[PDB]
Each structure stands twice: as C-alpha cells, then as structure tokens.
Design a protein around this ligand. Sequence first.
Ligand SMILES: Cc1cn([C@H]2C[C@H](O)[C@@H](COP(=O)(O)O)O2)c(=O)[nH]c1=O
Ligand SMILES: Cc1cn([C@H]2C[C@H](O)[C@@H](COP(=O)(O)O)O2)c(=O)[nH]c1=O
Ligand SMILES: [Mn+2]
Ligand SMILES: [Mn+2]
Length: 174
Amino acid sequence: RQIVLDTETTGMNQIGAHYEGHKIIEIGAVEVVNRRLTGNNFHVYLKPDRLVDPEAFGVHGIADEFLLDKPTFAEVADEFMDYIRGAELVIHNAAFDIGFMDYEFSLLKRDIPKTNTFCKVTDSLAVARKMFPGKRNSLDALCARYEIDNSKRTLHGALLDAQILAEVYLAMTG
Ligand SMILES: Cc1cn([C@H]2C[C@H](O)[C@@H](COP(=O)(O)O)O2)c(=O)[nH]c1=O
Ligand SMILES: Cc1cn([C@H]2C[C@H](O)[C@@H](COP(=O)(O)O)O2)c(=O)[nH]c1=O
Ligand SMILES: [Mn+2]
Ligand SMILES: [Mn+2]
C-alpha cells in the first residue's frame, strides 16, 4: 500500500522546529495499490484550539469558525494510525508533514513511536528534484509538466492536494 498524504496547518515557524506551537487542521490521504487509486481515502478537519495565522489562511482559506465543531487530533489519531501503518507515505516535502504528525502524536503522551518507524516515508519533492534538477518542482509546476488538472486549486486543500499529488506521482513513476 502507498498512501499519498498532505496536511494543512495553522502555519509554521521559519526558525527552529517548524511545527512548534502550531497545529494540523486538515489531513487528506489517498490509497494507491498496484499503481491504482483504490478510492478508500482518509479525510478529516481538526479543531486546533488556536488561531490560524493570516499567511496560512491566505493559502488554504480555512476559517477558524469552521473548525470549532471538528474532532481534535486525539480523537482521530487511532484510526489515522490504523490507516497509514506499514504503508509507504508519499508526501511533497515530507519532512514538513511528518514533523507535524510526530509533533501531534507526541502531544498525546501515549509513547507513540516516530512515524518512520512504522511507515516508509518518500519525499516526492526530493524525487522530483532528482528527476528534474535545476527546474521548478512545486506541485503546481509538476501538474503542468505532467498535464494534471489543478484548476480547482486556487486555494490549497489537504485532500485536494493529496489527490493531485497522487496523479502526479503515478505519472512521475509511470
Ligand atoms: C505555501 C505555504 C504554506 N504554509 C503552511 C500552512 C498550510 O496549511 C501548510 C500546507 O502547505 P502545502 O502547500 O505544503 O500543503 O503549510 C504557510 O504557512 N505559508 C505558505 O506560504
Ligand atoms: C520545510 C518547508 C515546508 N514548506 C511547506 C509550505 C509549502 O507550500 C509546501 C510546499 O509547496 P510546494 O512543494 O508545492 O512548492 O511545504 C515550505 O513552503 N517551505 C519549507 O521550507
Ligand atoms: Mn503540503
Ligand atoms: Mn496542502
């Protein structure tokens, strides 16, 4: 199993641990088996209990009010782990999302091990950079390169981004 994943957050830090003090507000993950999308995905919006930074809002457009009635990371953590366990996670700039995931897992105080100890982690951005050195390798740049539709991506979304990356990664490794 390959799980193409993405997350949206309240923001990030430019110095020090990028996730410190921030929270995941959306998790989007899509399953790929034998190079085919299975359709069995994972998608949740989470209540951060903190405000979304303006810069972050400018990217995903997810309002603070929309998250008030959502589950907390603690409430979705078990099913989330059941879903990703043992798979190869494919993430564009993996260190970003993995950092946030392990951070949130650690706050649960359940002795949950690091994600890369129970999941294989593949950074699709590193893969793209290796294949296309000296070129633009953002997800949008890769969409144009592989003729993938990203017209509905004015604002970024975790599931939306994961789905697009899945198509891009399948083409990049096809
Ligand atoms: C592109 C970008 C993302 N982010 C944070 C908030 C987003 O929810 C999260 C998602 O990045 P993404 O395009 O890698 O899915 O990263 C910023 O804080 N500023 C930015 O300029
Ligand atoms: C570690 C890190 C993560 N990120 C997050 C926010 C970006 O939108 C996302 C990557 O977007 P991109 O691979 O589509 O250009 O990852 C950065 O932008 N810069 C960084 O240095
Ligand atoms: Mn992302
Ligand atoms: Mn995203």
